[PDB]
Design a binder for this molecule. Structure first.
Ligand code: V1A
Ligand code: CL
Ligand code: CL
Ligand code: CL
Ligand code: K
Length: 164
């Protein structure tokens, strides 16, 4: 297991434009296209992202290319954020993947708002951090995924992704 395999489990793979858990047009391995309700706007974002006229369908190689860019962008967002970088630097590699996962799903600004959870993680108070992380819209709206990510923070193991 690693961050790519973990997010591939959590996000799935679909080669046509679909709506994510929030209703937003998405493609590939969780590549958010736009929050606009216009499918035409989403198709324009897709063509710009891929570099060709796609009409809403991409190949697996193209999906994996966007996915690698998106994982890279999540890490870069962590490293450039004054609240996320110290927590990231303090963590082992397994728990770093859990933080990347959250940033991939909700963005740098959203995760940086988990001020109290981040402090408990930096303090390595793993059970307390896990309890605090679940007191969130994130957990309530995507509880099965949040439980996997939280277990990863709590234990520093890949146990929540093993049977998947
Ligand atoms: S985050 C944060 N809050 C307190 C003041 C408890 N800290 O020492 C951190 C970990 C920098
Ligand atoms: Cl709490
Ligand atoms: Cl709550
Ligand atoms: Cl879920
Ligand atoms: K998804």
């Amino acid at each position: 297991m690693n961050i790519f395999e973990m997010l591939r489990i959590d996000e799935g793979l679909r080669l046509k434009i679909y709506k994510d858990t929030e209703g937003y047009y998405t493609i590939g391995i969780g590549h958010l296209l736009t929050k606009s309700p216009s499918l035409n706007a989403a198709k324009s974002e897709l063509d710009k992202a891929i570099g060709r006229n796609t009409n809403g369908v991409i190949t697996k190689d193209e999906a994996e290319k966007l996915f690698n860019q998106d994982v890279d962008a999540a890490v870069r967002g962590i490293l450039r954020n004054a609240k996320l970088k110290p927590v990231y630097d303090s963590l082992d590699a397994v728990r770093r993947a859990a933080l990347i996962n959250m940033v991939f799903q909700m963005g740098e600004t959203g995760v940086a708002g988990f001020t109290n959870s981040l402090c408990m993680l930096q303090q390595k108070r793993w059970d307390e951090a896990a309890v605090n992380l679940a007191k969130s819209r994130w957990y309530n709206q995507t509880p099965n995924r949040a439980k996997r990510v939280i277990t990863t923070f709590r234990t520093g193991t890949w146990d929540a992704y093993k049977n998947l």
